[PDB]
Design an enzyme around this catalytic site. Sequence first.
Site, PDB file in Angstrom:
ATOM      1  CG  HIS A 185      45.097  14.463   7.078  1.00  0.00           C
ATOM      2  ND1 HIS A 185      44.151  14.308   8.067  1.00  0.00           N
ATOM      3  CD2 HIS A 185      45.988  13.454   7.246  1.00  0.00           C
ATOM      4  CE1 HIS A 185      44.459  13.257   8.809  1.00  0.00           C
ATOM      5  NE2 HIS A 185      45.569  12.724   8.334  1.00  0.00           N
ATOM      6  N   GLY A 233      51.666  -2.926   6.495  1.00  0.00           N
ATOM      7  CA  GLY A 233      51.743  -1.980   7.597  1.00  0.00           C
ATOM      8  C   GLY A 233      50.509  -1.992   8.481  1.00  0.00           C
ATOM      9  CB  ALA A 255      49.683  -4.401   1.358  1.00  0.00           C
ATOM     10  NE  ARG A 285      58.785  19.770   9.485  1.00  0.00           N
ATOM     11  CZ  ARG A 285      59.200  21.028   9.568  1.00  0.00           C
ATOM     12  NH1 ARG A 285      60.457  21.365   9.292  1.00  0.00           N
ATOM     13  NH2 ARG A 285      58.344  21.955   9.937  1.00  0.00           N
ATOM     14  CG  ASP A 300      41.354  14.996  10.086  1.00  0.00           C
ATOM     15  OD1 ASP A 300      42.057  14.825  11.104  1.00  0.00           O
ATOM     16  OD2 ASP A 300      41.820  14.965   8.928  1.00  0.00           O
ATOM     17  CG  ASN A 321      56.423  11.193   1.544  1.00  0.00           C
ATOM     18  OD1 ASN A 321      56.089  10.009   1.500  1.00  0.00           O
ATOM     19  ND2 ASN A 321      56.434  11.898   2.673  1.00  0.00           N
ATOM     20  NE  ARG A 378      58.483  11.564  10.620  1.00  0.00           N
ATOM     21  CZ  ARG A 378      58.088  12.741  11.098  1.00  0.00           C
ATOM     22  NH1 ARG A 378      56.851  13.171  10.879  1.00  0.00           N
ATOM     23  NH2 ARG A 378      58.939  13.496  11.785  1.00  0.00           N
TER      24      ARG A 378
END
Lengths: 331, 329
Positions: free
Chosen positions: A187, A14, A12, A98, A159, A105, A92
């Site tokens: 996405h 960010g 919130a 990765r 997109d 995540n 990041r």
Amino acid sequence: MKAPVRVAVTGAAGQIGYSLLFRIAAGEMLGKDQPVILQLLEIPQAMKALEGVVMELEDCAFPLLAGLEATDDPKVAFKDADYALLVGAAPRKAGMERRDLLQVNGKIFTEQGRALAEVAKKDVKVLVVGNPANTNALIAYKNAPGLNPRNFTAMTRLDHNRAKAQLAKKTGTGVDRIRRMTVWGNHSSTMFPDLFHAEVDGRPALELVDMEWYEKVFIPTVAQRGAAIIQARGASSAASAANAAIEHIRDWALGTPEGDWVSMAVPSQGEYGIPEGIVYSFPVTAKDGAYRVVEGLEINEFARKRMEITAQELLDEMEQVKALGLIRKLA
Amino acid sequence: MKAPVRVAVTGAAGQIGYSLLFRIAAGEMLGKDQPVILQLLEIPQAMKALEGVVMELEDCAFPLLAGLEATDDPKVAFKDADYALLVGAAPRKAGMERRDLLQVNGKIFTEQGRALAEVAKKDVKVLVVGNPANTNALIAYKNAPGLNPRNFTAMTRLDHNRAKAQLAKKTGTGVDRIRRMTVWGNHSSTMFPDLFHAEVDGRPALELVDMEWYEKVFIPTVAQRGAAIIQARGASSAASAANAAIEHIRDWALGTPEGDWVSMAVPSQGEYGIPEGIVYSFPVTAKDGAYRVVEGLEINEFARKRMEITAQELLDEMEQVKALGLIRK
């Protein structure tokens, strides 16, 4: 007359949150007649900043803002939530590769999925914005036993809107006259913006632009658009991402216009032969908090090939999270 | 649908701009039936970023955004403008004293006032947001010959809104039930938030809070609120400032609610004994692009004292700009 609904938003403090929260509190997402209670989540290190965002929200004197609470506990943020916008994902960080990102995540969306299933309304509508959105949504719903998987979605609306904007600019027409745009799949760089069913003031898009432009210019430009914003601004596209999130929830809750559809990434039930369970962007219509994939559309070779490529990427992402034991199975 | 209006915004790639433009394009400032043409101004070094902001606006697919153009030329940005939001002011660079800032702002607002007078609609409505707003508005309108000085305003709506927010919090009431808040004078540390006429769900504010709280807690807290946001976020209050600008223009162009009023800094015509010419925040009602100062209000000693302090600050600021020959002496 309307009782307040509770809207949970993570990440919130960010950049996306800062462009999102004020428009939600202003009534832009759920209607000018719909009071909202904002339940805001941050990580502990961002709580000081979140309290600053709370002060700014207070300082707008929003008449629809019926409640406002900040927390670092997902079980507090999601308590009795009617909507949950999962914006905060793994940051990041230098050194992180990765697999490290996947694990962070994994932890975030496992925990949030579990929290939603425990404390949110059973019919909570969930939108995952934080990247990688489709696979994060898969992790969330798989770890939300007792909740309808189709209440979990991922955002491809940015997109979708970018594609409408490009088509409007090329054809010299108002963007409000672009209908039936579809972005299929992930996405990601493999997303497929589909002009075969799109209409420009009622006329098929491909009667106004050609296949060479579509393949050589349109598709890559829509794919690169996020990078283009960064190169120009030195910052990511937070405001248009926030706008897309507002539109995704709004169209789901309030409904899509007659004769039109929107793009939403949702758990596949085999529509168009897309493997069941993966969160895949489809053309959808919505009415009153419920949506359905628009089936029956003709899929030619150009489209099928691209839909299959992006499906395969999603399957590869699924296998990686399955290998990390973040979900047991896709089915 | 209404014929489109042209809305000029300066400092368009900056933080306030980034929180401002999307809500304008969404119809939040001038109504859902009012298409807008956004004419965006930046300094040359910020044009690259502004083009990025332009792309983001495009990527929102706003049905009401009838035109969108970026420029570094004020005579282009202000051309046929119906509204001008002057957000960009002198940037605070290391080594610049107040006198240096004043010189830069003098240049900016002389140039923009002249440009508005030359190319905008004669009835262009102007709001100065960039600091110091009241004095920048003074420089602008004094250098805008042929334009109604009354069409030049500065923003105190953020202080106004912050004041309402603090009173709602203290009284445990919804902010929607706070009416008749006033912030008088300068958008600076001398601003005076007035509770003597404010109402909380129809009840006089000072029947619910006491004078000790008012003087010792309420006033300093409203004054420090911008600093509080910076200490918390590590960044200034861009989103709530943008919101305040939107409301300032909205309530001016459309209208203030029946029985209520808002705060706007406007060129003084001697209302309440305030010196003439200085841009000073007053309680005002408004509709259809015209405002009227709410006159006849009882001004007690506590209010009068603070109203005069902030008036004197604005006078001193005016004397500073006159001495640099920025406006006629």
